[PDB]
Amino acid sequence: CGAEYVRALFDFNGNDEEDLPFKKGDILRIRDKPEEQWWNAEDSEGKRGMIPVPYVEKYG
């Protein structure tokens, strides 16, 4: 896409440290990147959290 679009192939609704919940095949937009591992993305609910980049992928 381009509009900071990332898909979560993995699942982890959990929240070890206030992480961002998601499943396999979820859509999450890339907002900011406070960390090098976890980025602040927005799930399909305007929920901004630190989603794992290694758990999600980049869209076209």
UniProtKB/Swiss-Prot annotation:
Tissues expressing this chain: Ubiquitous.
Subcellular location(s) per record: Cytoplasm; Cell membrane
Domain (SH3): residue spans on this chain: 1-60
Mod. after translation: This leads finally to the down-regulation of the Crk signaling pathway. Isoform Crk-II: Phosphorylated by KIT.
Functional summary from the UniProt entry: Involved in cell branching and adhesion mediated by BCAR1-CRK-RAPGEF1 signaling and activation of RAP1. Isoform CRK-II: Regulates cell adhesion, spreading and migration. Mediates attachment-induced MAPK8 activation, membrane ruffling and cell motility in a Rac-dependent manner. Involved in phagocytosis of apoptotic cells and cell motility via its interaction with DOCK1 and DOCK4. May regulate the EFNA5-EPHA3 signaling.
Entry domain remark: The C-terminal SH3 domain function as a negative modulator for transformation and the N-terminal SH3 domain appears to function as a positive regulator for transformation.
Family recorded in the similarity comment: Belongs to the CRK family.
Record note on quaternary structure: Component of a complex comprised of SH2D3C, BCAR1/CAS, and CRK. Within the complex, interacts with SH2D3C (via C-terminus), and BCAR1/CAS. Found in a complex with ABL1, ABL2, CRK and UNC119; leading to the inhibition of CRK phosphorylation by ABL kinases. Interacts with ABL1, C3G, DOCK3, DOCK5, MAP4K1, MAPK8 and SOS via its first SH3 domain. Interacts (via SH2 domain) with BCAR1, CBL, CBLB, PXN, IRS4 and GAB1 upon stimulus-induced tyrosine phosphorylation. Interacts (via SH2 domain) with several tyrosine-phosphorylated growth factor receptors such as EGFR and INSR.
Designated name of the protein: Adapter molecule crk
Organism (species): Mus musculus
